[PDB]
């Protein structure tokens, strides 16, 4: 049970980190599309460029 | 058609180039190229900024100032005549899109800082950042990942225009294999890279990429990972020389994805570095000879400095 539960916990963390990375930048993609950020060129696109590392952390 | 980046600027704004009367921005220079040389050093000498045509190189008391910039100031210059320890003329051209590790305003500052506020005519100004630095990586997923830049403030115009034109989107035996994928880091900062629009749209895209005010840098990620095959390269004791050792170092100062075009003088290691690029890069390469005259030659030093010949020869 345990090692199979362990390797599946490895397997889901693989699935965790991958599609997170795949979506949060895809979120960061359309973050610009249809909106030039809140009040500046850089602003929430920094805001989103800093929020997404603590989500993995 | 669709082949128009920024052509060389100066065409007007000057009448009887003996500007003994006007020289107005040169008067800004000639103030400080002349107010500065009093106590045994010049601390001046603006490279003799001339608005039309080109400007010069001082190169007669370079010491450290213009002797470092005997080379470095020459990036967009070309130094077309050569001389003795005197002045040295140049021309001016497209060579800022090569100089893309630096901003057109950053050089403009040092263009002023060399010139001791010897101020531009503006002619160069209206031709400084006409093409913002922008690359085109060809990343592992078979065509390209839609790389932008280290710097973000360019997608803001782009993604508000481009997708509304065209969208984008055993153990130890394998432990090191992800340690290589661990090395696939942030591309020096943030990358801002998007997903391939189906490989048949970039031709439709490139013609509109330049259409605003940007220009694109096609790359070649063919060295770390490559999905098709790799030929047998082999550099059999081909000791070479630092004129062309610098060359591929200019072709590769970055990672494994950047194309290259290098000028040599005549009779130089022409059939060497391409043969060096034939083998080091690990590609499946092509030579386009001028005539069969070239074709016999270029394989021959390839037959010399490569042992890749077992009917492995395609002329």
Description:
- Chain B: This is General transcription and DNA repair factor IIH helicase/translocase subunit XPB.
- In chain A, 79% of the residues lie in helices and 0% in strands.
- Chain A has 57 residues and is mainly alpha-helical.
- In chain A, helix 1 packs antiparallel against helix 2 (43-56).
- The longest helix of chain A is centred in the N-terminal third of the chain and has 31 residues, at 2-32.
- The two termini of chain A are 28 Å apart.
- With 315 residues, chain B is mostly helical.
- Chain A binds chain B through residues 26, 29, 32-33, 36-37, 41-42, 45, 49, and chain B through 152-153, 155-156, 159-160, 163, 168-169, 190, 194.
Q: What is the gist of this entry?
A:
It is classed as transcription. Chain A has helices spanning 2-32, 43-56.
Work out the oligomeric state of the chains in this entry. Answer: part of a larger assembly
Radius of gyration of chain A: 16 Å
Q: Any idea what the shape of chain B is?
A: globular
Q: Report helical residue fraction of chain A.
A: over 70%
User: Which pair of chains has the greatest number of interface residues, and how are they split between the two chains?
Assistant: A-B, 10 and 11 residues
Strand content of chain B: under 5%
Shape of chain A: elongated
Query: Helix and strand string of chain A, N-terminal first?
Result: HH
- Across the major sheet of chain B, the strand order is 1-2
- Helices and strands of chain B, in order, run as HHEHHHEHHH
Q: Helix amount of chain B, in percent?
A: 25-40%
Structural class of chain B: mainly alpha
Q: Using only CA atoms, what is the Rg of chain B?
A: 24 Å
Number of helices of chain A: 2
Q: Given the structure, what is the number of helices of chain B? A: 8
Distance from N terminus to C terminus of chain B (CA atoms, Å) equals: 33 Å
Q: Which class best fits the helix and strand makeup of chain A? A: mainly alpha
How is the main sheet of chain A built?
A: none
Number of E-state strands of chain A: 0
PDB class: transcription
Keywords: Transcription initiation, Molecular dynamics, Gene regulation, Community network analysis, Global protein dynamics, transcription
Entry title: Structure of the human apo TFIIH
Chain A: CDK-activating kinase assembly factor MAT1
């Amino acid at each position: 049970q345990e090692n199979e539960q362990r390797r599946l916990f490895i397997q889901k963390e693989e699935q965790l980190q991958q599609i997170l990375k795949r979506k949060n930048k895809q979120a960061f993609l359309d973050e610009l599309e249809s909106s030039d950020l809140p009040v500046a060129l850089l602003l929430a696109q920094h805001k989103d460029r800093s929020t997404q590392l603590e989500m993995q952390l | 058609p669709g082949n128009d980046p920024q052509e060389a600027v100066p065409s007007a704004a000057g009448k009887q180039v003996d500007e003994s009367g006007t020289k107005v921005d040169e008067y800004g220079a000639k103030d400080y190229r002349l107010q500065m040389p009093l106590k045994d050093d010049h601390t001046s000498r603006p490279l003799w900024v001339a608005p039309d045509g080109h400007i010069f190189l001082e190169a007669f008391s370079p010491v450290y100032k213009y002797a470092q910039d005997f080379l470095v100031a020459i990036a967009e210059p070309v130094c077309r005549p050569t001389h003795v320890h005197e002045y040295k003329l140049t021309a001016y051209s497209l060579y800022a899109a090569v100089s893309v590790g630096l901003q057109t305003s950053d050089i403009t500052e040092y263009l002023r800082k060399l010139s001791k506020t010897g101020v531009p005519d503006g002619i160069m100004q209206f031709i400084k950042l006409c093409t913002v630095s922008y690359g085109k990586v060809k990343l592992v997923l078979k065509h390209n990942r839609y790389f932008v830049e280290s710097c973000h403030p360019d997608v803001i115009q782009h993604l508000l225009q481009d997708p509304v034109i065209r969208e984008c989107r055993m153990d130890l035996f394998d432990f090191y294999e992800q340690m290589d994928k661990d090395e696939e880091e942030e591309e020096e900062t943030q990358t801002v890279s998007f997903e391939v629009k189906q490989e048949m749209i970039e031709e439709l895209q490139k013609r509109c990429i330049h259409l605003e005010y940007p220009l694109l840098a096609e790359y070649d990620f063919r060295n770390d990972s490559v999905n098709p095959d790799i030929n047998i390269d082999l550099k059999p004791t081909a000791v070479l020389r630092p004129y062309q050792e610098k060359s591929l170092r200019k072709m590769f100062g970055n990672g494994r994805a950047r194309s290259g075009v290098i000028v040599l003088p005549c009779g130089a290691g022409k059939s060497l570095v391409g043969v060096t690029a034939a083998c080091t890069v690990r590609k499946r390469c092509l030579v386009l000879g001028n005539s069969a005259v070239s074709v016999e030659q270029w394989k021959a030093q390839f037959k010399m400095w490569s042992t890749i010949d077992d009917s492995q020869i395609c002329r």
